[PDB]
Write a protein that binds this ligand. Structure first.
Ligand SMILES: C[C@H]1CCC[C@@H](O)CCC/C=C/c2cc(O)cc(O)c2C(=O)O1
Ligand SMILES: C[C@H]1CCC[C@@H](O)CCC/C=C/c2cc(O)cc(O)c2C(=O)O1
Lengths: 269, 268
């Protein structure tokens, strides 16, 4: 029942994408590592509730690596939002609910603000607004040193579930290993300044639902809680840390389904 | 230069208290374990900046154990605030900056709201507003079981610095051993419903500075960040988790001094 295919957009990207189900569109945008197999279990659970679920590897990453250098260097939320709109156009997805974590969170907020006609509602998780010098500084290391250090960081610091993270398996981890240097060079210096949450009044009243991981150290996304509260945006927690779709796929799926259902009800009302 | 003494208040409590320094009064209210030796290093560092610093063991805890049962059972923020005002009265402290964590945070917000003429400014850290059934359920266990469970939770889960926690030393840990059952039976079922943060508008424009531990899991005090932001209260982070005065005593002392100095400037 799952479509697994490729599609090229006129900006030069050949995307790997997956699609399952029929009904209103839900689009799952990856975190900065750009790997959509992390959604595999949740895609089936969401689609089984009457939704068409689409996801894809991000440009330069995993199976979407056939892309121009512009699409994975000096990356901003606004560049990623333009890329996501390009694949939604190619797949004839006119109206979508969107989810994203990390750079995907910055992307879905940029999508909702920039393309309001196209986005039913956005779910953002752990949106990076601050530069982190220790992360930015990995960009000057050799590829194999970046891959070693960031594989260790993802497992031990932010996975929210070491058994589930390792259980992604060799094929996924081999793709992530090649993505770490692309991520490290392209994302950490340019994503946080692009954060589309600097104008709090622009967020007020928008169909946005914001989460942080329950186990994430308070300092990591303290600023997200403050910003969401100042904007009156619904803010809550998911179990785990940065990858709830890996650590707690059933809870993640239920959240996505219940939030989309809430916005479908409010759309008619 | 540290005074270490006792004082009796007419509510029946004989307090163990310490005091150091000369200048505006700063009062350090313990967390629910009620043990003021946790402030030892910070009391000297704060007093050295030109403050009279006072702290005390809480009623029924450590060296303030000579107290009526009502002061350490069915404990609320409003009861604790009334007890702290009693010791400030006895020590002739008319105007005070106050710090508290946990039940001490509930106490200092109840003090600022209930006794505004007495409180220059309050610093609250990690204020519990939710019942936690697993913690509440320790109340029905035997004393030795409560002490073993909670000693482990403090050391391994929420100290924010296990080496600094261990370094409080054998005497402090022997007092905490006896406090754990008193705390378990008197605090976790009654402190959260008494949280003086039900009325967001009552907090607005008050001289309150709120913190959460940087390493504390987001879910523990997520509600504090939301409430402070809704009330326009200054909200920030300290290093560590629930006991910054243990884990990071120099950062803690600098925060208490700089915050007190900010409110002394604004007062004038
Ligand atoms: C892969 C995730 C892990 C974040 C975990 C999060 O808990 C810790 C922060 C690590 C930084 C993540 C991040 C930072 C940026 O500036 C840009 C990004 O795209 C990310 C990002 O996508 O990082
Ligand atoms: C000793 C501290 C530890 C806080 C750890 C901090 O991480 C919060 C987790 C444990 C709950 C503590 C607590 C709960 C209450 O209902 C009442 C209280 O007075 C406390 C309290 O004072 O607990």
């Amino acid at each position: 029942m799952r479509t697994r295919s490729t599609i090229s957009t006129p900006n030069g990207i050949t995307w790997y994408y997956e699609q399952e189900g029929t009904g209103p569109d839900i689009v799952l945008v990856p975190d900065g590592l750009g790997e959509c197999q992390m959604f595999d279990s949740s895609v089936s659970q969401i689609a089984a509730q009457g939704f068409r679920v689409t996801t894809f590897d991000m440009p330069g990453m995993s199976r979407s690596a056939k892309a121009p250098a512009e699409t994975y260097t000096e990356v901003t939320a606004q560049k990623l939002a333009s890329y996501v709109i390009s694949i939604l156009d190619a797949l004839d997805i006119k109206h979508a609910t969107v989810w994203g974590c990390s750079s995907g969170a910055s992307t879905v907020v940029a999508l909702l603000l920039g393309y309001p006609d196209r986005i039913r509602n956005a779910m953002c998780h752990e949106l990076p607004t601050k530069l982190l010098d220790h992360l930015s500084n990995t960009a000057v290391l050799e590829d194999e040193e970046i891959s070693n250090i960031l594989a260790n960081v993802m497992l031990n610091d932010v996975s929210g579930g070491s058994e589930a993270w390792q259980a992604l398996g060799v094929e996924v981890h081999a793709r992530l290993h090649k993505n770490y240097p692309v991520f490290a060079r392209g994302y950490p210096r340019t994503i946080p300044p692009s954060a589309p949450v600097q104008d709090v009044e622009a967020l007020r009243g928008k169909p946005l639902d914001w989460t942080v991981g329950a186990a994430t150290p308070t300092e990591s996304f303290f600023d997200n809680i403050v910003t969401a509260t100042k904007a009156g945006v619904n803010i809550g927690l998911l179990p785990g840390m940065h990858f709830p779709y890996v650590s707690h796929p059933d809870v993640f799926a239920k959240y996505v389904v219940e939030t989309t259902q809430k916005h479908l009800w409010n759309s008619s009302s």
